[PDB]
DNA sequence: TTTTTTTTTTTTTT
């Protein structure tokens, strides 16, 4: 049974090679004494001194190449466009460096937004927010991809299953294993990462007494995990999105889930 | 006249019968200058007044027709005044650079139509009507994400096709788009990617200044949308307006069965 | 499988007695002919049917023959069916015009007006099994007690009558219309409940009416309408909240008098529902 | 085939 045909990403792919250029083609301000060359090549090959599987880039600098118009499509449509930024970077560093899962972080964002400022438009978009920690919870692994199979009786199919449930594998296997069936969960081949849930509280100085500040969770996915300390206010990356527990999918209930691919302790 | 259901309020009349409503002080016992100040600011959100169509004619009855069926007339009104804001554009011709401010949406905020007393007096006989209400804001519920256009995929092909959520419901095709493929493959709904808008909820006491004496005041159930979300902080008796809404709830738990008594809240059109 | 046994109780003729009970009478024109109208005239909602005149009417139905079967005792011995039968015949002799109905005016009055006008007109195209009688009412039915000084006719024992304590309340009192006295406590706030409750359909429309029976029910969608059904694939359908009717409901517990009670024995409060006017 | 639960007693504590 042939697979035809894959699609597409279109603009997302245009932004793939365009952001590929930007991540490769500087991304630099000052010639000579700068702040030149690339600085990201210096940074990624210095990141190959380490291979911690993470990067730092400025959004402000991301403006300059397209005057920020690409920064837009990566601004609101970001969640949609992530898978390309990474493998595009990977395509680029495949020209440079080699057991690899790369993690993006964007900082120096245009403006700090409030929790009261939190709205549905921000979904799949980068945003800067800061405030006080509540209850850091112990770190427990992120599935990313897993190996689970068979699936009746050994399909050994290992990849993907990265959906947010996170169950399950066993989807459309082997051939011919015909699962259904058990996944069956294969844990050992699965690469894991992070993560801890830290609920941020809205800061007192800004909040308008009487208020009782209404606050939600910041999840720490990325090596930026754990860097926080209770009581501090910290710049965050937006990624509004949503979480499962009003609508239902007829063959539910949802709420705000704040994530950051990047965090700094400032504040 | 475009007769509609039992609401039976004529389209392409109210729009027109509101269209001559333009330019009246009058009387009173603004008007178009509010419509006028609106456009430079581009804030949208018509504030209105109400009473308007009361008592001035035309539409002395339409003032009632909105009270009777607000869900409809608000749709018509916003729709009309979008075009009336377009109609003011033809005098100055090219405006605001240009037709995009005509693309920018508008909405009416009717308030102070009659005064109905408390949640206490509220009745089943009227399940749709606008109500003057009071009481202090208790708490602001967390921001509720809301479903507008649901996004879908499959492993077939994999493809990106998405459809409107419409009423609170979700119906995707079991299969399939693109191409074609078809194929038995189940639809892949991305939870996150789909379109969303802001809704909230607030619980509110009924006129804590007033009591049926001695019994405790009943609780106002309010929700709102857009700007009205995070409107004011709380502890505000002040005033509230909106049409009534009620919905049955599932019970035990899960099970997909009704509780056979409708949970009752307010569509909360406006507050001043 | 479900054994079945004859009993002297028969609803058949009692229905007829109810027809002759209402609109035909004198002592209190009669109260049942134009007040019923005043309900259909929309100046009143509650239909107050006194056990008093059930007694006085049996004074017209016995003494004063010809003799008639028992009523107030048959009433307070059952208490529930007499609102589904005694009231169901009221549809028959209710005045038509009635006076000055208008339409809108009242919200949803035009809805039901055009409900059955679009129903008969969409039924007129198909003809060129009906909305249940409980759907169009706009009147509640309230029985009132006979203490009574004229209960001394007498039927003697059959009068309760007495505002007995909940301790006095018994298991054989299920399905029995009675007087109880006691203090109001906690008095749940008034809330709408439900009655039929027409949910619209999506492709060719029509409608179906799910009866509101008991305290809960299963919701339903599929498609019932033959046209949206089987072609194609099935007409979707959702609830129309303005097609719904809600009877008024406020439930309140009533505690014992505390001097009705034996000396020990903590007060026993009982559960009550409110319906209507 | 699953259902559904906060006072009262005692305690250690500024």
Swiss-Prot record, chain A:
Signal peptide: none annotated. The modification Phosphoserine is found at residue 211. It is found in: Nucleus. Component of the MCM2-7 complex. The complex forms a toroidal hexameric ring with the proposed subunit order MCM2-MCM6-MCM4-MCM7-MCM3-MCM5; loaded onto DNA, forms a head-head double hexamer. Interacts with MCM10. Belongs to the MCM family. Present with 13400 molecules/cell in log phase SD medium. Acts as a component of the MCM2-7 complex (MCM complex) which is the putative replicative helicase essential for 'once per cell cycle' DNA replication initiation and elongation in eukaryotic cells. The active ATPase sites in the MCM2-7 ring are formed through the interaction surfaces of two neighboring subunits such that a critical structure of a conserved arginine finger motif is provided in trans relative to the ATP-binding site of the Walker A box of the adjacent subunit. The six ATPase active sites, however, are likely to contribute differentially to the complex helicase activity. This is DNA replication licensing factor MCM6. The gene is MCM6. The chain holds residues 97 to 463 of 1017 of the full protein.
Curated annotation (Swiss-Prot), chain B:
Present with 8800 molecules/cell in log phase SD medium. Early fractionation of eukaryotic MCM proteins yielded a variety of dimeric, trimeric and tetrameric complexes with unclear biological significance. Specifically a MCM467 subcomplex is shown to have in vitro helicase activity which is inhibited by the MCM2 subunit. The MCM2-7 hexamer is the proposed physiological active complex. Component of the MCM2-7 complex. The complex forms a toroidal hexameric ring with the proposed subunit order MCM2-MCM6-MCM4-MCM7-MCM3-MCM5; loaded onto DNA, forms a head-head double hexamer. Acts as a component of the MCM2-7 complex (MCM complex) which is the putative replicative helicase essential for 'once per cell cycle' DNA replication initiation and elongation in eukaryotic cells. The active ATPase sites in the MCM2-7 ring are formed through the interaction surfaces of two neighboring subunits such that a critical structure of a conserved arginine finger motif is provided in trans relative to the ATP-binding site of the Walker A box of the adjacent subunit. The six ATPase active sites, however, are likely to contribute differentially to the complex helicase activity. Coiled coil: none annotated. This is DNA replication licensing factor MCM4. It is found in: Nucleus. The gene is MCM4. The chain holds residues 177 to 467 of 933 of the full protein. Belongs to the MCM family.
Swiss-Prot record, chain C:
Acts as a component of the MCM2-7 complex (MCM complex) which is the putative replicative helicase essential for 'once per cell cycle' DNA replication initiation and elongation in eukaryotic cells. Core component of CDC45-MCM-GINS (CMG) helicase, the molecular machine that unwinds template DNA during replication, and around which the replisome is built. It comes from the Eukaryota. This is DNA replication licensing factor MCM7. The chain holds residues 4 to 338 of 845 of the full protein. Component of the MCM2-7 complex. The complex forms a toroidal hexameric ring with the proposed subunit order MCM2-MCM6-MCM4-MCM7-MCM3-MCM5; loaded onto DNA, forms a head-head double hexamer. Interacts with CSM1 and MCM10. It is found in: Cytoplasm; Nucleus. Belongs to the MCM family. Present with 166 molecules/cell in log phase SD medium. Early fractionation of eukaryotic MCM proteins yielded a variety of dimeric, trimeric and tetrameric complexes with unclear biological significance. Specifically a MCM467 subcomplex is shown to have in vitro helicase activity which is inhibited by the MCM2 subunit. The MCM2-7 hexamer is the proposed physiological active complex. It comes from Saccharomyces cerevisiae (strain ATCC 204508 / S288c) (Baker's yeast).
